[PDB]
């Protein structure tokens, strides 16, 4: 773990925007 | 103390030697240095400063510091005389007007107590036209026989042809190195 918010996975783009 | 390391170094060759490049401007000093180091007639501009290089022959690395014969560079020849063991003089056999200037410069350089252990080394430059003098006329004009306590040898070298450079190098090596 790490202080200041755990790292989270990010997407590649907005899949709902086509 | 022990001299085993010195003997081991001298068994395969350790002596290097030194040399100087002096003479009148445009007398083939830079061309002679290029031929001695590289071996080709390389065209260069006037020697505003100086040319520093080293030549390896017969297991001796005789570094040659070419110095131009210009008025602004003639007084700078004393800077290169420090820590210098050899001196090579480039004569202009095709430049009769500059012959007197070259002789005066050589006499002034030889009249210094610092440059006393260096043997005379005059190269008969401009050995490409019939107007060039022989190995005795140039020496007589320069008065090489009147230099007491100076080992001077007359050698004719042509920048375009390159002949005579080996003889001058051998004479300089014999004058400096006196071993088997």
């Amino acid at each position: 773990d790490r202080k200041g918010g755990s790292y989270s996975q990010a997407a590649g783009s907005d899949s709902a925007q086509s | 103390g022990n001299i085993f390391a010195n003997l081991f170094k001298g068994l395969f060759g350790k002596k290097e030697m030194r040399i100087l490049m002096v003479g009148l401007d445009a007398a083939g000093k830079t061309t002679i240095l290029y031929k001695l180091k590289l071996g080709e007639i390389v065209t260069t501009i006037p020697t505003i400063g100086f040319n520093v290089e080293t030549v390896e022959y017969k297991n001796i690395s005789f570094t040659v510091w070419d110095v131009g014969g210009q008025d602004k560079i003639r007084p700078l020849w004393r800077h290169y005389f420090q820590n210098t063991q050899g001196l090579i003089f480039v004569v202009d056999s095709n430049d009769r007007e500059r012959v007197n200037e070259a002789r005066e410069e050589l006499m002034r350089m030889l009249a210094e107590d610092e440059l006393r252990d260096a043997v005379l080394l005059v190269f008969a430059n401009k050995q490409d036209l019939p107007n060039a003098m022989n190995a005795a006329e140039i020496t007589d004009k320069l008065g090489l026989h009147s230099l007491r306590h100076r080992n001077w040898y007359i050698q004719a070298t042509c920048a375009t042809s390159g002949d005579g450079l080996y003889e001058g190098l051998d004479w300089l090596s014999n004058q400096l190195r006196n071993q088997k």
């Binding site: - | 505003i48 400063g49 100086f50 602004k72 700078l76 800077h79 290169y80 420090q82 820590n83």
Partner: protein, 177 residues
Amino acid sequence: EIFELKAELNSDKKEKKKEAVKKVIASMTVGKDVSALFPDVVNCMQTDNLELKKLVYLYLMNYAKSQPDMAIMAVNTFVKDCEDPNPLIRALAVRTMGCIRVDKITEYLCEPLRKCLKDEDPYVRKTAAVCVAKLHDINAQLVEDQGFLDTLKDLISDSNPMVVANAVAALSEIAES
């Protein structure tokens, strides 16, 4: 001290020459007048090591105004270094040529400046533009005679966009004065 440093600089050992150069640089940075040793370091200037060349150039630049007469023995070295294959060496030589505040030094550097004006390397082009701007600031008449205004103007419409920006800044500085 001074005698020992001069003896070390007048030697043929690369490590000793480097140590002497470092000591001279430290003394100069600490506030020591090392300009009297500039003629001694003139002989130990043409060195293969890049670190020693930079220190020698810095000493000459800092000892050029102090000893303008002793700076006349560096035109040949600068000319030789201006054709170095390494772009870093050429850029350093161009910067040192323009940084030398010698009236008679920039006159003989016009040919190297013209040669480096058309340098293909963007860093080389930027260095040439900076040297041209420095020469124009030192001598506007010399810059005009050398015709560097046309080269500076054409540098803007070329590649090396950082080089183009350097040339544009140099042209603006010339026009500013």
